């Protein structure tokens, strides 16, 4: 969810700027574990 | 009328360098106990340091066709230009062969050239090929040729390489041409007469004394001088001494009477010198020139002088004989007469005298292989254990 | 004629390049990332005072090492002869494994692409294919790293697949947008991807049984690759590549790492459009391998049983393809098809089973629109 939030941040920068489709743009589930581990820290931390 | 390369030959690989413009004759080495890398020792330099071609040596087991290699390996011939040929380090044992790994010195196609114990595999064999056109595949080898030597595991050159400071022997693509000399020949050599590169004892006088350096006194400055002494010291590697001649082809062959050599304690590794004080003293490689550490035998005191006799190729006349000979060590430039200064675990200093006394008649007993071997493995392991020792304690 | 050649080429090492003489050289990763520099350098790249009259450097560059590497990954001798252990094909094969290392290979696959953009008026920029890095390049590089080293360690497979396989297909995904699709830098991506990576990822398809530590990388390699699937600039042997290097898979696949998948087929099934004949066929062969693992409560004793969730999303698989087959009117390939699929999914659902009333909540359908598949 977390990261959905931003993508919707990164999708306006995308309208903004017009083009330069970001490869991270893919959902969560499709990311790889080593970019998921920046909000698995997150998730990790908050809920223990 | 021209010697042919065959088997069961002692040889040496020989290459040219043009370090600094200048040009410098090299040799393929390695010291078989420890490290088993290959390198490169000079023998250009023959005047200033000695070569060691004790690990120089090399002996040609076996020199097969290509195809029955192949077959061979599916299940005193002379060299014919177009075999592989097998290496066999004469003084540790094992074979020449591509390591297969590599130090990384600026090539990494590189593999690093060493010795190994088994035979079997591609990695021992090196096949054999013309250096120029004048002698095609299948032709005899001479003695006096160029030669270059492919493995046939990597195929690739036995390579001298510029690219460090220090020169490398390396299994490249390019190619460098190697040259073979022969060492000697023991098919042909007769028993109990003095060869080239033999370690031997000194016998001197009727009380079998041998000329030794101090015993084990925890130190190498005190193990630098020279006296006679007998008893249990003749059954020990204290005293043995090894006969390097000058020259570096045809270095086994037999001495002849009045043969400029130099003698080196395998021990310690110093080699005999006469200082200008009319003393002998124990200096190292590096120090030992030939004025300094020359010495020939002679077979009386007459002090006639044969002049100059041309240095024979081949096997030579056998004249030193073991027990039966009496000798006289003389220094070359000096022409002094080692003798013994009988000033006395009899511990007789040993000097050199421009008369010396009526008794400075010696005999010269062979050490055995294993003697010599173990012998050779104390020096080379004394050598490590002291560089450790000093490491450590820096 | 290989074994003459390469040992030409090893005679001669002039041929090799700069890079590869082994005299001081950087290296084939480091040549490429030099030749990319050339291509984004204009002053270095051409001439500098049509094709003929510029000649992209670096492009030539580039073209060069590919050639080689390709030349010596079709010189590399045959599987079956270096199985039977014919010491001159293992030979040749080592001395190219000298010439060439591992890392290198790794590096330049792992080297990626300039992404073709949309600009600001909405008309796609493409960046000239001619000059630059391009995926027939990595094509050579691929073929290399099959024939000579093969891929036959799940560790390495794996290791190339985060290094320079997955952003590939990733990119490829993200590259099928209806303006973008039609660029030709995605006509050669896929041509890469569907030549080279896809039928290697086939042929290794046995290594992938051993993957339950990397589940989100295996569960996005399946995503990636379903999405593809789902792109439609693909040509009919590109789709059928893609679809039979996805069912050799997740034939091997351990079962409890589909449901991940299996979380996106059932919501796009029930269309039972042409996009969804190869879905059908990945459900019904992973449904009779693994009939066990949902019918019996102990399933595989090392698998285990399902986590009941996949039990649910089964279900209203079943039902939504039962319905949708219902009012479809009847086409004799698509029923021959769902057929199949329907039994498989009915005796592997537990008869004995009962639907949980409670729903299940956070519906990625949502997130998962139309446009742009989220």
Redesign the interface.
């Known amino acids: 969810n977390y990261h959905?939030i931003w993508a919707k941040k990164k999708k306006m920068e995308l309208e903004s700027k017009?083009?330069?489709?970001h490869?991270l743009?893919?959902?969560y589930?499709?990311?790889?574990?080593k970019e998921?581990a920046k909000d698995r820290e997150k998730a990790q931390d908050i809920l223990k | 009328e021209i010697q042919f390369l065959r088997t069961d030959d002692e040889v040496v690989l020989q290459c040219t360098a043009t370090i600094h413009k200048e040009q410098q004759k090299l040799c393929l080495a390695a010291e078989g106990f420890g490290n088993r890398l290959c390198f490169l020792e000079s023998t250009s330099n023959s005047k200033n340091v000695p070569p060691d071609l004790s690990i120089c040596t090399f002996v040609l087991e076996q020199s097969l066709s290509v195809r029955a290699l192949q077959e061979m390996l599916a299940n005193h011939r002379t060299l014919l230009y177009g075999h592989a040929i097998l290496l066999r380090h004469s003084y540790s044992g094992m074979y020449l062969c591509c390591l297969s790994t590599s130090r990384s010195s600026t090539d990494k196609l590189a593999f690093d050239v060493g010795l190994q114990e088994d035979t079997t595999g591609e990695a021992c064999w090196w096949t054999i090929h013309p250096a120029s056109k004048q002698r095609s595949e299948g032709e005899k080898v001479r003695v006096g040729d160029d030669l270059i030597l492919v493995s046939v595991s990597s195929e690739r050159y036995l390579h001298l390489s510029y690219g460090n400071g220090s020169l490398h022997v390396d299994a490249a693509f390019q190619q460098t041409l190697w040259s073979v000399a022969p060492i000697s020949s023991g098919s042909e050599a007769a028993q109990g007469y003095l060869i080239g590169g033999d370690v031997l004892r000194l016998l001197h006088g009727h009380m079998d004394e041998c000329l030794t350096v101090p015993s084990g006194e925890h130190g190498e400055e005190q193990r630098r001088t020279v006296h006679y002494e007998g008893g249990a010291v003749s059954v020990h590697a204290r005293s043995l001494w090894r006969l390097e001649t000058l020259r570096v082809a045809w270095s086994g062959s037999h001495i002849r009477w009045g043969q400029p050599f130099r003698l080196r304690h395998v021990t310690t590794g110093k080699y005999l010198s006469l200082m200008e004080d009319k003393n002998l003293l124990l200096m190292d490689k590096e120090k030992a020139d030939v004025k300094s550490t020359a010495f020939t035998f002679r077979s009386s005191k007459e002090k006639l002088d044969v002049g100059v006799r041309k240095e024979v190729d081949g096997m030579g006349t056998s004249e030193i004989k073991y027990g039966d000979s009496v000798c006289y060590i003389q220094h070359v430039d000096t022409g002094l007469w080692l003798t013994y200064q009988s000033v006395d675990s009899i511990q007789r200093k040993a000097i050199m005298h421009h008369e010396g006394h009526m008794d400075d008649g010696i005999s010269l007993s062979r050490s055995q292989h294993e003697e010599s071997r173990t012998a050779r493995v104390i020096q080379s392991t004394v050598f490590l254990f002291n560089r450790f020792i000093r490491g450590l304690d820096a | 004629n290989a074994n003459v050649v390469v040992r030409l080429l090893i005679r001669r090492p002039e041929c090799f390049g700069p890079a590869l003489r082994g005299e001081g050289g950087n290296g084939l990763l480091a040549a490429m990332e030099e030749a990319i520099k050339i291509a984004e350098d204009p002053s270095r790249d051409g001439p500098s005072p049509e094709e003929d009259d510029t000649i992209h450097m670096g492009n030539a560059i580039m073209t060069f090492y590919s050639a080689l590497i390709d030349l010596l990954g079709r010189c590399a001798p045959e599987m079956h002869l270096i199985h039977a252990g014919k010491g001159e094909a293992i030979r040749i094969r080592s001395i190219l494994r000298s010439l060439i290392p591992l890392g290198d290979l790794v590096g330049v696959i792992s080297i990626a692409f300039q992404m073709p953009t949309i600009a600001k008026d909405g008309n796609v920029v493409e960046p000239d294919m001619s000059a630059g890095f391009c995926p027939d390049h990595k094509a050579a590089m691929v073929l290399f790293l099959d024939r000579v080293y093969g891929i036959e360690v799940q560790d390495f497979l794996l290791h190339l697949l985060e290094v320079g396989f997955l952003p590939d297909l990733r990119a490829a995904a993200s590259l099928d947008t209806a303006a973008l699709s039609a660029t030709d830098m995605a006509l050669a991506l896929n041509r890469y991807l569907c030549t080279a990576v896809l039928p290697l990822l086939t042929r290794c398809a046995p290594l992938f049984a051993g993957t339950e530590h990397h589940a989100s990388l295996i569960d996005s390699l399946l995503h990636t690759v379903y999405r593809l699937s789902k792109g439609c600039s693909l040509t009919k042997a590109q789709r059928d590549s893609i679809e039979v290097c996805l069912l050799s898979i997740c034939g091997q696949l351990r079962p409890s790492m589909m449901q991940h998948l299996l979380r996106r087929l059932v919501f796009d099934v029930p269309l039972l459009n042409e996009h969804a004949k190869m879905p059908l066929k990945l459900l019904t062969n992973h449904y009779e391998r693994c009939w066990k693992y949902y019918c019996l409560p102990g399933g595989w004793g090392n698998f285990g049983a399902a986590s009941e969730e996949e039990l649910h999303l089964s279900r209203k698989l079943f039902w939504g393809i039962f319905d949708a087959l219902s009012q479809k009117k009847y086409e004799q390939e698509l029923f021959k098809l769902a057929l199949p699929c329907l039994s498989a999914v009915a005796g592997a659902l537990p008869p004995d089973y009962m639907e949980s009333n409670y729903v299940s909540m956070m519906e990625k359908q949502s997130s998962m629109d139309s446009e742009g598949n989220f």
């Open positions: 959905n017009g083009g330069g489709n490869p743009l893919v959902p589930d499709t990311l790889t574990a998921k």
